Design a protein around this nucleic acid. Structure first.
Ligand code: GFM
Ligand code: CL
Ligand code: CL
Ligand code: CL
Ligand code: MG
Ligand code: NA
Ligand code: NA
Ligand code: NA
Length: 326
DNA sequence: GTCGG
DNA sequence: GCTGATGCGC
DNA sequence: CCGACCGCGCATCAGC
């Protein structure tokens, strides 16, 4: 929060470009600037000082100067007053509704929470659940609750098959005191990059979690990725907990390290690391790290026995999960 | 919007 | 039905 | 300048 004012401004600009302008690269440009500045150990005194940081160019340096001088940004001020921009931005807050769907709904005159509710007939499944838990999904999850959720998930998975290994990733693994949702990496010995010896490996787990009333809704579900909703059980007479977003990713057991690296993030950390990888002649995904041939085509997966090996390949000193919150 | 070749 | 492009969220 | 901007699972749709 040393430069919270500036980072908030840049984040609002990023969201505008993504949601309204549908300019993904501008969105990322702003996110990166925000990220590099949030990391800066000094209270920024000027745009010039900020421009010294990679990702902060002339345009953002000018904005920072305006913000520092007046405490606000006219460009944003105008965006906030724009009804269409505001409506589109709002709708995209519903899980399942992106920049395209938001603009379309706005064209059809659907611009508010009240509108969405009286038009649930025009929403797909995911959007319908996002609307249902709109408020809850806005709430953060105290680490204390994440621990209870972890306890439930691991024990229930154990009951299904003792050979399953569930690992909570996301900001939780990065040591955050609160998280926006729960991300679970799952592995089973029967499923490797070599073969799938048992079907419904993910299904069984999802089924067991619904059975004990932990998982309450499903946004989408495939053979390797589950995206849904869960809720901690409450005690007698006590107000029940808010519903929470939960993602479960089944990854080949032999590709655990690339998988946990990916699911631990952050998202910007992953983007920066994958981009650095390319520069170094490698490509990284949640499964492997492969070298790039003379032409630029990915080669065969390189041997990996720890997260550190991945860092070593691209000549990066190792960084503990807690230092990957970019 | 920002960067390196 | 399929393949491929797109939206969306990660 | 001017191309590059991470990489991918699932839902949905068009076109066949
Ligand atoms: C935002 C959080 F801090 P919280 O959920 O606690 O509020 P976190 O859990 O970190 O993110 P979230 O749950 O959206 O996605 C989980 C991981 O997926 C990976 N991931 C997400 N988005 C991307 C992306 O665009 N690219 C890549 N490569 N990985 C991504 C890295 C992410 O860490
Ligand atoms: Cl763009
Ligand atoms: Cl691995
Ligand atoms: Cl791969
Ligand atoms: Mg998360
Ligand atoms: Na700069
Ligand atoms: Na959304
Ligand atoms: Na998530």
């Amino acid at each position: 929060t040393l430069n919270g004012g500036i980072t908030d401004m840049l984040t609002e600009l990023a969201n505008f470009e993504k949601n309204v302008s549908q300019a993904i690269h501008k969105y990322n440009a702003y996110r990166k600037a925000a990220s590099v500045i949030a990391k800066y150990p000094h209270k920024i005194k000027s745009g010039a000082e900020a421009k010294k940081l990679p990702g902060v160019g002339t345009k953002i340096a000018e904005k920072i100067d305006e913000f520092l001088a007046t405490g606000k940004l006219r460009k944003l001020e105008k965006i906030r007053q724009d009804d269409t921009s505001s409506s589109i931005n709002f709708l995209t807050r519903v899980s399942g509704i992106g920049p395209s769907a938001a603009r379309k709904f706005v064209d059809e005159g659907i611009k508010t929470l009240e509108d969405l509710r009286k038009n649930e007939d025009k929403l797909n499944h995911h959007q319908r659940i996002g609307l249902k838990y709109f408020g809850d999904f806005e709430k953060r999850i105290p680490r204390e609750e994440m621990l209870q959720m972890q306890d439930i998930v691991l024990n229930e998975v154990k009951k299904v098959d003792s050979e399953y290994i569930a690992t909570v990733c996301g900001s939780f693994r990065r040591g955050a005191e609160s998280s926006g949702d729960m991300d679970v990496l799952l592995t089973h010995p029967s499923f490797t990059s070599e073969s799938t010896k048992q079907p419904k490996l993910l299904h069984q787990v999802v089924e067991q979690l619904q059975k004990v009333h932990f998982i309450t809704d499903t946004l989408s579900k495939g053979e390797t990725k589950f995206m849904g909703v869960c809720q901690l059980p409450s005690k007698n007479d006590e107000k029940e907990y808010p519903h929470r977003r939960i993602d479960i990713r089944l990854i080949p057991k032999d590709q655990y390290y690339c998988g946990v690296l990916y699911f631990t993030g952050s998202d910007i950390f992953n983007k920066n690391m994958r981009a650095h990888a390319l520069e170094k002649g490698f490509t990284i995904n949640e499964y492997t790290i492969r070298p790039l041939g003379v032409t630029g085509v990915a080669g065969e997966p390189l041997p990996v026995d720890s997260e550190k090996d991945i860092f070593d390949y691209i000549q990066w000193k190792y960084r503990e999960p807690k230092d990957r919150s970019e």
